[PDB]
């Protein structure tokens, strides 16, 4: 597959995020337990709540499609559907809202992905969400200064940075340690305080941000200069218009 047109680094980065063959760079290590605490849906050690029985106990009807589509583990178990949501700064965060949604539905099974300007969300079965959330937090999808995990009060994607280069956050869920240059998450994604903060590592430097970002900007790579990408968008507009008429 080709995923996306264009000849900028931005276009290539958009392609890499979507490409399931492309190995996302791992930048940090987060414990399984700390993923659960960030998500905030259950306590580590707690059993997964269920919304319906396991599929094996349901005896569901003869249906060639059901037989042919393997459910994800959480669906077999009857897990709740829960979520993780990210806000990405327009100042060169690596991932961006439509990039995320496009990439999730190329990479992950059983995904409900939504895109907004200030938030991007994925809802799926609880135990599968935890495996996905680790990769979304450990890899280049995430920078702890220009990206944030926020289930509410998402304001920030369009705001100026603070003096440390951190994105604004109403609820100050992620804190830059000026004396050590590392970001700690001190609350879960809905804003409740954590017993012990989680280390998220060092912010990427601006040079690396520019190299990895998927946003076009005049002070990075401008969309108007990626003429092959622009041409394809104008083409879709023209063909949609003609199709609708005749």
């Amino acid at each position: 597959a080709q995923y996306y047109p264009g000849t900028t680094k931005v276009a290539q980065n958009r392609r890499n995020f979507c490409n399931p063959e492309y190995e996302l760079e791992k930048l940090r290590e987060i414990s399984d337990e700390d993923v659960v605490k960030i998500l905030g849906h259950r306590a580590p050690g707690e059993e997964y709540p269920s919304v319906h029985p396991p599929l094996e106990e349901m005896d569901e009807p003869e249906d060639a499609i059901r037989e042919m589509v393997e459910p994800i583990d959480g669906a077999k178990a009857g897990d709740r559907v829960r979520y993780i949501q990210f806000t990405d700064s327009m100042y060169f965060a690596p991932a961006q809202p439509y990039v995320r949604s496009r990439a999730y539905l190329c990479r992950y099974r059983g995904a409900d992905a939504g895109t907004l300007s200030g938030r991007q969300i994925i809802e799926t079965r609880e135990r599968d969400l935890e495996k996905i959330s680790k990769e979304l937090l450990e890899t280049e999808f995430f920078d702890p200064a220009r990206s944030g995990v926020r289930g509410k009060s998402v304001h920030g994607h369009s705001l100026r940075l603070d003096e440390d280069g951190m994105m604004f956050d109403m609820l100050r869920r992620q804190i830059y340690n000026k004396d050590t240059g590392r970001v700690e998450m001190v609350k879960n994604q809905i804003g409740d305080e954590l017993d012990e903060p989680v280390d998220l590592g060092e912010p990427l430097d601006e040079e690396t941000l520019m190299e990895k970002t998927t946003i076009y900007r005049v002070d990075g790579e401008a969309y108007r200069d990626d003429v092959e990408a622009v041409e394809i968008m104008q083409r879709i507009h023209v063909l949609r218009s003609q199709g609708g008429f005749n």
Binding site: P5, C18, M68, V81, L105, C106, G110, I236
Partner: protein
């Protein structure tokens, strides 16, 4: 025939049934089984005799929480259902041995009622079914128990609710698949104002049969609306064949190839591959490490794209066994395919647009709800002309129990009564066989 196209027809297990059938043998205007389904939907009414009886016993009539103290009537309706049903049938039928049908279910608790076709030959629309059924059962109940003039108006209230003070049958103990004509978003929309949950209920959650019935209703509505006239007729017929009837086994095969490990993106890759091989699309132009695809037949590209869209829904929501993500699949299948090919998405953007609002109004405070309460007449999901709603039906069919407003919550009476009609429960079998039987008359 007006079109040269022919399609291979398959059954719901992936088996060939008939080869190279003219496209118009699947047309609502020509296929007699579609005619049977549409007329059956117009004329079929479910009556809840247990509910009528309980409403009279408690004087709970006219809507939620309503009660008139002092008006209670204790009548043994379920215990006399056979005699009530027979008296009702004589009033409903036009002649002895016509196509009237009145069957009791659940030991007299419900009644399946199919009003004779002759009544609709001299009717403008479809309300004769509930209104003739309602008054026949009201009269039969009054006659069975010698209900007095002074009390009979409570029986009326128990059957048809607060009508005519309300415009709808508010609190009624009868049910239809269709809603009243006043609630149409526009003329010609009636076959679209059928709740997705009703379709899933009538087909007992068989994914391909729910997709088929939904597609039949949506695309038949497009003829009544005039959308499938002239230059657009072929597009709509191809969408009906490929997205809803598993033409050429394309949907089935895409799901087979992607069901164990697939994603939406992997279904897209296979579909583009198949479209290239079958000659539907061709390389038109080369950019830097990117091929621009073109097509000489937009209607056929649309149909292929729409079959993949179905398969992607089946694969994504089938994996989660959770319907809610269908709004995401409908959006990003189409968004991804456009930047994969340089060609327009299904319904030239209208499925993607429908999916945007459908996502918002199924994950926000402002309205809508869960996937099963939507329909082609809903302001949120009316914009695509038949290519989005059948995927919602398929996704709800695959839902294992994640919805609070499930078909069991909204459509129990439909499940119990309408699923009994063979053409409603397995429409794919009957439409395909009828198409073979007429293949050489088209």
């Amino acid at each position: 025939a007006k079109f040269e196209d022919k399609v291979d027809l398959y059954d719901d297990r992936g088996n060939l049934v008939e080869e190279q059938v003219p496209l118009e043998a699947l047309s609502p205007l020509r296929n007699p089984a579609i005619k049977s389904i549409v007329q059956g939907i117009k004329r079929t009414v479910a009556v809840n005799l247990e509910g009528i009886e309980n409403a009279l016993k408690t004087a709970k009539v006219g809507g939620p929480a309503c009660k008139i103290m002092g008006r209670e009537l204790d009548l043994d309706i379920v215990g006399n259902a056979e005699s009530i049903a027979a008296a009702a049938k004589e009033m409903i039928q036009v002649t002895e041995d016509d196509d009237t049908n009145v069957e009791l279910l659940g030991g007299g608790k419900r009644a399946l009622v199919q009003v004779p076709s002759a009544r609709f030959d001299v009717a403008a629309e479809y309300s004769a079914a509930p209104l003739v059924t309602a008054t026949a059962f009201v009269q039969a109940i009054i006659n069975e128990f010698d209900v007095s003039m002074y009390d009979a108006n409570m029986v009326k209230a128990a059957v048809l609710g607060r009508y005519p003070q309300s415009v709808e049958y508010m609190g009624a103990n009868i049910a239809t698949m269709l809603d009243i004509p006043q609630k149409l978003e526009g003329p010609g929309y009636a076959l679209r104002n059928i709740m997705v949950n009703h379709v899933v209920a009538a087909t007992l959650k068989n994914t391909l049969q729910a997709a088929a019935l939904s597609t039949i209703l949506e695309q038949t509505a497009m003829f009544e609306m005039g959308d499938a006239v002239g230059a657009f007729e072929r597009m709509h017929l191809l969408g009906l064949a490929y997205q809803g009837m598993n033409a050429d086994n394309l949907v089935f095969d895409l799901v087979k190839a992607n069901g164990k490990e697939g994603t939406v993106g992997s279904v897209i890759a296979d579909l583009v591959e198949r479209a290239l091989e079958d000659g539907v699309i061709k390389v038109e132009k080369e950019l830097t490490d990117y091929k621009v695809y073109g097509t000489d037949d937009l209607a056929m590209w649309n149909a292929y794209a729409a079959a993949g869209l179905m398969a992607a829904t089946m694969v994504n929501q089938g994996a989660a066994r959770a319907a809610q993500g269908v709004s995401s699949t409908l959006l990003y299948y189409n968004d991804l395919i456009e930047f994969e090919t340089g060609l327009p998405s299904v319904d030239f953007g209208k499925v993607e647009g429908t999916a945007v609002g459908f996502s918002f109004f199924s994950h926000s405070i402002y309205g809508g709800g869960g996937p099963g309460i939507f329909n082609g007449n809903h302001i949120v999901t009316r914009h695509s002309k038949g290519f989005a709603i059948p995927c919602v039906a398929a996704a709800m069919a695959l839902d294992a129990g994640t919805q609070m407003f499930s078909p069991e919550a909204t459509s129990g009476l439909i499940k119990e009564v309408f699923s009994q009609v063979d053409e409603f429960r397995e429409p794919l079998k009957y439409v395909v066989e009828a198409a073979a039987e007429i293949k050489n008359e088209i």
